[PDB]
RNA sequence: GAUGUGCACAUCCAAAUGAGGCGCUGCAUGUGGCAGUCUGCCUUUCUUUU
């Protein structure tokens, strides 16, 4: 596997349970606010997420359309608690059916809002970035920047961020988490071009902090708050 | 004696092979019985088998070992052996007699369940369905218990542990509530739609393309060509450096072999106009593809991912929308 | 996840699954299918402890 995409970690679990990561963070931001999800795998984060902080709407969305998927079986998974043996649930598939709304229907309860899209974000065209219009009102990219770092180099990074930038409304922020220097080496023989990139990086992770705070972005302030966690908010009005 | 054991060994393998279980339950040794004059079979054909090969190759030994028998017997030489005991109909208690067991620790062995289930009671038959050939158990065993008292006994003594019948019931349980589940979606889209010779033969639309690279996927030479000029086929071997593409005027092959600058500048390629016998040997091409994609039969998809995959497809429609 | 050397270098392993078995239509179709068929049916399963 190339992309840094695990099939494992699968999880039977609702919402109240979750690995980890949500004790950290703070749930003033995500209420009635649309969010895009980069790199999320089966979205056992993102589920529980939209299940306690009831977001208003949330789209996951990753590169590795085979795992979308059963991303989508753990979506119907929930709806089917209404026990059962797991050499049948194995064979079978989840009980329930994919929730499809009516026309006239009421969003905002789970699991009605979020969707999972499998798409490419890196459009590798600075011309086809500047065309884009803000539609989301948080972004959450964590544990992504290594991978999209070693496979489309310095170029693809700026276009990522600029891309970022430019689908943010004003107002909306940005939550990082970006892996150290220190890791990427032990992966560089994976393939021909992670390696021939990992040769070719002139940006370190700690400069991060500085090119998104430089006008070919134009995040305005930032700050730190307890890996590090990063936010950025974009301009007021 | 460890020669002791292996005689012990070839005894337990050979009357388990020849136990009523194994012979209700496979096939294959039942039709080596059953295709034979006085019913039998030569120990040469048992050595064959994989778990007789770790223990002995020598058949004579092997002849040895079946002296003290309960069910086995052996006729002149100690070559061949035969049943000893004449075999009718299948048993009906076995199905009630039988356990299902879930949460394997993933080790998967036969002496492994004949350790742990033992102890309770006579353990007969056990059943491992591997991981598709991959040597991976899947994580649940079917273990059959003799005379119907120590199964309901062993249920008791335990790691879930469930009868067949009550497997059956809830196996039906769980797939009316699918089908209910999934037959009222069906309404609910069904109700959402309801309220909202082949090709002509054209000389000069056939453009062969040359690559000193591999070319790329039939998506990506189809969204090349198509934003030029209107494709109708693009033939395309995967991993192949050529290809073709037939287009639906000359006008448009000339405006894709014109166009230099959106094509050749920018994907190394020599894409030129085929007339006459390369022509006529790919329109025979296409003639041969058509009869043969004509003469195979319809590929198989099952109904359920169709419907999901329709399902998931509105979903993010009216998402979007 | 592990190993050798003095957290650093080098090497090894990554695959915690789901689309696995088999059809019927009635239209199209080198156009890479579409709409149905009880969720199309079945799964202890594409199993050799032959
Ligand atoms: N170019 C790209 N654009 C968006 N996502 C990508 C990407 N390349 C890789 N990814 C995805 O990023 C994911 C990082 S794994 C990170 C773990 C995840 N954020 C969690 O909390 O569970 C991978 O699964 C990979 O599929």
């Given at each position: ?52 902080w ?7 969305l ?67 970035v ?37 689908h ?21 023989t ?47 009005s | ?5 292996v ?16 012979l ?9 019985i ?11 054909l048992?050595?064959?088998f994989?778990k ?142 309801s ?96 009869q ?23 979903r ?6």
């Amino acid at each position: 596997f190339q992309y840094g995409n695990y099939c494992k970690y699968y999880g039977y679990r609702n919402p109240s349970c979750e690995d980890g990561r949500l004790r950290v963070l703070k749930p003033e931001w995500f209420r009635g606010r649309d969010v895009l999800d980069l790199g999320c795998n089966v979205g056992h984060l993102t589920l529980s997420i939209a299940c306690k902080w009831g977001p208003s709407r949330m789209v996951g969305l990753d590169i590795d359309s085979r795992l979308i998927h059963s991303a989508r079986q753990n979506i119907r998974h929930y709806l089917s608690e209404e026990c059962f043996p797991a050499s049948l649930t194995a064979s079978r598939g989840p009980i329930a059916a994919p929730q499809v709304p009516l026309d006239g229907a009421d969003t905002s309860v789970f699991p009605n809002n979020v969707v999972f899209v499998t798409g490419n974000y890196v459009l590798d065209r600075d011309d086809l970035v500047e065309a884009q219009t803000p539609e989301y009102d948080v972004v959450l990219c964590l544990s992504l920047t290594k991978w999209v770092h070693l496979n489309w180099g310095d170029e693809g990074l700026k276009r990522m961020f600029r891309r970022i930038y430019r689908h943010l409304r004003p107002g909306g922020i940005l939550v990082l988490e970006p892996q150290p220097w220190s890791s990427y080496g032990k992966r560089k023989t994976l393939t021909e071009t992670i390696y021939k990139n990992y040769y070719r990086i002139q940006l370190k992770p700690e400069q991060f902090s500085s090119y998104l705070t430089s006008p070919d972005v134009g995040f305005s302030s930032y700050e730190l708050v307890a890996r590090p966690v990063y936010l950025f908010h974009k301009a007021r009005s | 004696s460890r020669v002791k054991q292996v005689l012990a060994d070839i005894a337990k393998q050979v009357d388990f092979w020849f136990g009523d279980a194994n012979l209700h339950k496979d096939r294959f040794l039942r039709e080596q019985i059953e295709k034979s004059r006085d019913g039998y079979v030569d120990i040469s054909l048992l050595v064959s088998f994989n778990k007789m090969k770790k223990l002995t190759t020598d058949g004579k030994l092997i002849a040895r070992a079946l002296r003290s028998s309960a069910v086995v017997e052996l006729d002149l030489e100690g070559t061949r052996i035969r049943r000893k005991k004449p075999l009718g109909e299948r048993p009906k208690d076995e199905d009630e007699r039988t356990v299902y067991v879930e949460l394997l620790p993933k080790n998967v062995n036969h002496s492994w369940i004949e350790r742990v289930f033992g102890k309770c009671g006579n353990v007969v038959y056990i059943s491992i369905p591997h991981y598709k050939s991959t040597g991976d158990p899947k994580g649940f065993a079917f273990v059959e218990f003799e005379t119907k008292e120590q199964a309901a006994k062993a249920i008791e003594f335990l790691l879930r542990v469930l009868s067949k019948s009550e497997w059956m019931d809830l196996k039906k349980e769980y797939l009316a509530l699918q089908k209910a589940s999934m037959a009222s979606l069906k309404k609910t889209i069904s109700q959402i739609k309801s309220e909202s010779t082949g090709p002509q033969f054209v000389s000069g639309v056939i453009v062969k393309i040359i690559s000193t690279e591999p070319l790329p996927g039939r998506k990506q030479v189809r969204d090349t060509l198509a934003a030029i000029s209107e494709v109708l086929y693009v033939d395309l071997l995967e991993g192949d450096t050529e290809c073709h593409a037939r287009f639906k005027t000359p006008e448009d092959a000339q405006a894709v072999i014109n166009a230099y600058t959106e094509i050749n500048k920018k994907h190394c390629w020599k894409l030129e106009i085929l007339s006459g016998d390369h022509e006529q040997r790919y329109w025979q091409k296409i003639l041969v593809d058509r009869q043969a994609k004509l003469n195979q039969p319809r590929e198989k998809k099952r109904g359920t991912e169709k419907l999901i995959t329709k399902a998931e497809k509105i979903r993010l429609a009216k998402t979007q929308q």
